[PDB]
Amino acid sequence: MNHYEVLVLGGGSGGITMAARMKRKVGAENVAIVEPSERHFYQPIWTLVGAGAKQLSSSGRPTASVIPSGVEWIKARVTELNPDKNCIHTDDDEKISYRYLIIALGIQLDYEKIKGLPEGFAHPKIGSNYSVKTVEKTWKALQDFKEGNAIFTFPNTPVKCAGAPQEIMYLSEAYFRKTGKRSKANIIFNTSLGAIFGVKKYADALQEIIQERNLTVNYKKNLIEVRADKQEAVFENLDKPGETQVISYEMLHVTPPMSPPDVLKTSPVADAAGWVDVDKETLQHRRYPNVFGIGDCTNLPTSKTAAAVAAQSGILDRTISVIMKNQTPTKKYDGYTSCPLVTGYNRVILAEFDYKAEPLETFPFDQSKERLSMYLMKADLMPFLYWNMMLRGYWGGPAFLRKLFH
Amino acid sequence: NHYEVLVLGGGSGGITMAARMKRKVGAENVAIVEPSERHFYQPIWTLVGAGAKQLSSSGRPTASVIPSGVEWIKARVTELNPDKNCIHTDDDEKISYRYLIIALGIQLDYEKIKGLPEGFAHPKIGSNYSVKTVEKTWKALQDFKEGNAIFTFPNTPVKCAGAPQEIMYLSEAYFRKTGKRSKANIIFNTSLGAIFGVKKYADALQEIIQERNLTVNYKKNLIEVRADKQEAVFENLDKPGETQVISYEMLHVTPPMSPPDVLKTSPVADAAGWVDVDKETLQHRRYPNVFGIGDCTNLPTSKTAAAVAAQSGILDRTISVIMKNQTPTKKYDGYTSCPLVTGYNRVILAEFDYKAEPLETFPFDQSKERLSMYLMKADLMPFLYWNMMLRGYWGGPAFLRKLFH
Ligand SMILES: Cc1cc2nc3c(=O)[nH]c(=O)nc-3n(C[C@H](O)[C@H](O)[C@H](O)COP(=O)(O)OP(=O)(O)OC[C@H]3O[C@@H](n4cnc5c(N)ncnc54)[C@H](O)[C@@H]3O)c2cc1C
Ligand SMILES: Cc1cc2nc3c(=O)[nH]c(=O)nc-3n(C[C@H](O)[C@H](O)[C@H](O)COP(=O)(O)OP(=O)(O)OC[C@H]3O[C@@H](n4cnc5c(N)ncnc54)[C@H](O)[C@@H]3O)c2cc1C
Ligand SMILES: NC(=O)CN(CC(=O)O)CC(=O)O
Ligand SMILES: NC(=O)CN(CC(=O)O)CC(=O)O
């Protein structure tokens, strides 16, 4: 069997970041990354791409260019995990064993659970910022909008970046105003959830925006079907089983149902729901002590964000090092996570919070207010620091800077 | 091989639907894919765990309930390719169909709890949800001397939401009748924030919980069992990262549950792995020749055999009208029932619908503990299950409800 001291499953945000940290602990030649995709994306940029404010090209880099130098890149798809014999399988029929395993497989997009998708993306007026293949379609639908309903969906599953499904609504609302066609747009947010946001301090701020900008939010309404032919969308009422609603749209933004990667759903490393089953403090696996998880694929009960990944990477780095000395971990993850909500082409509400769903703000001023400073940070600073600091393993939590500023 | 109607699963919904469609398309045009040699009426296991009935009475050979002339393919489904109208089995056989009925039930995942299932090799721990552990529940009740009697409820969907607490009420009554109620601290450690999701019966159970000094610990989920040390670890779902290690003299485990593995990645599943069907007609949302019944579906109601029975009448008509190139008319109302055994001689018959509101068959108040309803569940309904439901002659109780009113 091909073998590595540290095997990283997934070459996305968590995988690359952990690979860089592990290169410095065990040496590059002793780390491998299993990743089939040729390109690595900073997916937060896609919110602004779908709003015409950023280029798709700028959100990605070739996977080969972010692989830490000297780390082995296995360009393949994991097809099975056998933790009881410390090995995995790839779709090349290659078997790889490990001393330590880091699982960073992200979350899976399930557009096809929506009837009429993804076939319907071949038609105009429908987009989705959650995929490289549909994010630009959001912008074209926003551009080509003339009159009617502008509908935005939130599915009945876990999601990554719970703020992005509505960020694009606020940007869409602002685009209509600057283009003079706000009068002609009826803006609808049909969300499976019962609340606009899970943290009150920020839910309150967004509700103020919903009121002042004439937005309609229908709660517990989930998209089940798209008739891209007829520009019709069917929504189910989760509170009244059986009841469905057909509504026309002049533009529709779809947030797809999402699930654990297929390979994990049936794996011994998953919990009953398919997520990597790890200690919520240390990120060591609950049942396989040489297995670790990070990012969207875990059952860490916090919002699945890249900011969360960075905080987790600092914790996991310390967990693994301590276990390699057969000591007990002491540093505990607090559920830190962050959704910088873009509320317009020049404003961001920087939501930061923790396992308790209470604010945990880095800056001493009130981040529930729309701010230009926070827009610039997200749109211009954070991508630079992602490629050049986070992916090299030198960005953990902002806890350091939060306590500096008191 | 090809069959007009292919039924996946030879359980409650599978056998029932096979019997009904035998009468629609002919027995020779129906097949059942089911690997298990024994078929169980699982509600009895609640009383087996309490020592009130024998496990032998719970099951019959699978061969004994297959409708005459229907093909029993004793194998395990391993793939579903609905776009080519076929499935694969663990015999490397490929079977095609004109219509597919998916009745694969729910899957139990004891191994997601560290220390299980190997912990069942030790004493003092049982589970009524498995044939291989339900009798261990009864022995744990027997051997209980002094300490904590722990009953759990997981953080996943469940079949029969009432059973995890039914065996607690029976266990309480058993300790009174053996004199050792004084020596038992009895706790229901549940992942949920409520004792029951329908208020009328939630109030009834809460009054029973207070009157018999039972402890309910909400948002507490079993994550590990140290069977050797008789210790059980719970996570606090309200404070991620916090745990609690508890000693037990008796532990009853309700395991985490999930969709069958073969469905988790299947195109017929919704994003969560449940069979994605219309909530009223039970026809699949994306493949119009596919149907779902029972625990494997995403029907948003309690997963119960009574729900299967009501669903079998709707699905029978749904499939019949589709065969006649017509659109289905009759809607499923989400009817389901958990007849809660509250003691060795009493039952709260909870019946409700999609809106989580009571829908009682009888005109009297079923919130009250009743011997009539105990006698019905313990003795009559098993008879009616083997002899009417599994023959396709039991659907919704709607008719009886309207008469009895
Ligand atoms: C539109 C949008 C906007 C967002 N905005 C923000 C934001 O403003 N702020 C924020 O913090 N977060 C945001 N996020 C979330 C952020 O992108 C993710 O949380 C983060 O990328 C998670 O990292 P990860 O490593 O867990 O997964 P990913 O970065 O998604 O990486 C997973 C990797 O696993 C690979 N993989 C999958 N299956 C297999 C397999 N079987 N074998 C091998 N490899 C496999 C994939 O190819 C991928 O490279 C946003 C997300 C979206 C979609
Ligand atoms: C302890 C307990 C007490 C209960 N009490 C009650 C009660 O009082 N009232 C009530 O209404 N309900 C009760 N229930 C629930 C009831 O038993 C179930 O809801 C009912 O059996 C659901 O039927 P089903 O056909 O959907 O699944 P099942 O009856 O479980 O049948 C599923 C079948 O699918 C088969 N199968 C699985 N995977 C595959 C595969 N890959 N290929 C082929 N076949 C496969 C299995 O072998 C099984 O035979 C109770 C359940 C338990 C565990
Ligand atoms: N949905 C709306 O249009 C406005 N709504 C806000 C909401 O739905 O939460 C109520 C209000 O403004 O008083
Ligand atoms: N008891 C009944 O309702 C009919 N039963 C008879 C029985 O098994 O008791 C089935 C049959 O027709 O043979």
Residue B87: phi and psi, rounded to 5, are -135, 165
Residue B261 CA: nearest ligand 2 atom is 41
Q: DSSP string spanning A114-158?
A: SBTTTGGGGSSSEE-TTSTTTHHHHHHHHHH--SEEEEEEE-SS-
Q: Does the beta carbon of B157 lie under 8 angstroms from any beta carbon of chain A?
A: no
Confirm if B126 and B138 have CB atoms less than 8 A apart. yes
For residue A356, give the chain B residue with the closest CA.
B239
Using the structure block, give the residue that is written with the tokens 């060795």. B344
Helices assigned H by DSSP within B157-304: 163-177, 199-211, 261-264
Q: Which ligand sits nearest to residue B391's alpha carbon?
A: 4
What is the rounded distance in angstroms from the CA atom of residue A159 to the CA atom of residue A259?
Answer: 8
Question: Which domains are present in chain B?
Answer: 2-106+259-404 (3.50.50.60), 110-258 (3.50.50.60)
Contact B156 A273 (CB under 8 A): yes
* Tokens at B206, concatenated: 């809460």
Q: For residue A251, what are the β-bridge partners? A: A150
Contact A241 B285 (CB under 8 A): no
Q: Smallest Cα–Cα separation from B186: which of B163, B210, B207?
A: B210
Of all protein residues, whose CA lies closest to atom 11 belonging to ligand 3?
A211
Q: Smallest Cα–Cα separation from B251: which of B133, B346, B107?
A: B133
Q: Smallest Cα–Cα separation from A318: which of A22, A15, A12?
A: A22
What is the rounded distance in angstroms from the CA atom of residue A196 to the CA atom of residue A152?
Answer: 13
**Omega into B256 within 30° of 0, i.e. cis?**
no
Q: Which residues contact B309 (CB under 8 A, 6 or more apart)?
A: B16, B389, B394, B395, B396
The C-alpha angle with vertex B113 and arms to B195 and A336, in degrees rounded to 5, equals 80
**A21 CB neighbour count, 10 Å cutoff:** 24
* Tokens at A274, concatenated: 């398919």
Confirm if A145 and A185 have CB atoms less than 8 A apart. yes
Q: For residue B186, what are the β-bridge partners? A: B149
Contact A286 B109 (CB under 8 A): no
Residues of chain A found within 8 Å of residue B280, distances taken between Cβ atoms? 241-242
Instruction: Determine which helix (DSSP H) or strand (DSSP E) holds A177, and give its type and residue range.
Output: helix A164-178
Residues of chain B found within 8 Å of residue A300, distances taken between Cβ atoms? 240
Pocket of ligand 1, candidates A43, A48, A107, A283: which has the most ligand atoms within 8 Å of its Cβ, to mutate? A43
- What are the CA-CA distances from residue A170 to residues A149, A339, A342, A344, B164 (Å)? 14, 15, 8, 6, 46
Q: Which residues contact A310 (CB under 8 A, 6 or more apart)?
A: A17, A390, A395, A396, A397
Confirm if B319 and B100 have CB atoms less than 8 A apart. no
Of all protein residues, whose CA lies closest to atom 3 belonging to ligand 3?
A216
The C-alpha angle with vertex B176 and arms to B171 and B178, in degrees rounded to 5, equals 90
Q: Which residues contact B242 (CB under 8 A, 6 or more apart)?
A: B235, B236
Instruction: Determine which helix (DSSP H) or strand (DSSP E) holds B3, and give its type and residue range.
Output: strand B2-8
Helix, strand or coil, per DSSP, at residue A299: coil
Residue B281: phi and psi, rounded to 5, are -100, -20
Q: Report whether A207 belongs to an annotated binding site.
A: no
Residue B43 CA: nearest ligand 2 atom is 5
What is the rounded distance in angstroms from the CA atom of residue A172 to the CA atom of residue A180?
Answer: 12
Q: Which residues contact B124 (CB under 8 A, 6 or more apart)?
A: B140, B143, B144, B227, B230, B248, B249, B250, B251
For testing contact with chain A, the best of B242, B257, B263, B270 (most A CBs within 10 A): B270
Q: Which residues contact B363 (CB under 8 A, 6 or more apart)?
A: B404, B405
Q: Say which of B273, B331, B334 has its CB closest to residue A265.
A: B273
Method: X-ray
Q: Smallest Cα–Cα separation from A136: which of A242, A45, A40, A37?
A: A45
- Rg of chain A in Å (alpha carbons): 21
Helices assigned H by DSSP within B117-221: 134-143, 163-177, 199-211
What is the rounded distance in angstroms from the CA atom of residue B85 to the CA atom of residue B292?
Answer: 15
Q: What is the rounded end-to-end Cα distance, in angstroms, of chain B?
A: 49
> Ligand 1 centroid vs A280 CA: distance in angstroms?
20
What is the rounded distance in angstroms from the CA atom of residue B390 to the CA atom of residue B384?
Answer: 9
What is the rounded distance in angstroms from the CA atom of residue B141 to the CA atom of residue B50?
Answer: 7
What is the rounded distance in angstroms from the CA atom of residue A14 to the CA atom of residue A116?
Answer: 32
Confirm if A83 and A270 have CB atoms less than 8 A apart. no
* Tokens at A322, concatenated: 């301590």
Confirm if B339 and B373 have CB atoms less than 8 A apart. yes
What is the rounded distance in angstroms from the CA atom of residue A278 to the CA atom of residue A285?
Answer: 4
What number of CA atoms fall less than 13 Å from residue A246's CA on the CB side? 5
Strands (E), A260-366: 291-293, 337-344, 347-353
Q: Which residues contact B229 (CB under 8 A, 6 or more apart)?
A: none
- Rg of chain B in Å (alpha carbons): 21
Confirm if A99 and A86 have CB atoms less than 8 A apart. yes
Confirm if A222 and A235 have CB atoms less than 8 A apart. yes
The C-alpha angle with vertex B100 and arms to B99 and B106, in degrees rounded to 5, equals 165
**Omega into B117 within 30° of 0, i.e. cis?**
yes
Residue B384 CA: nearest ligand 4 atom is 3
Confirm if A253 and A129 have CB atoms less than 8 A apart. yes
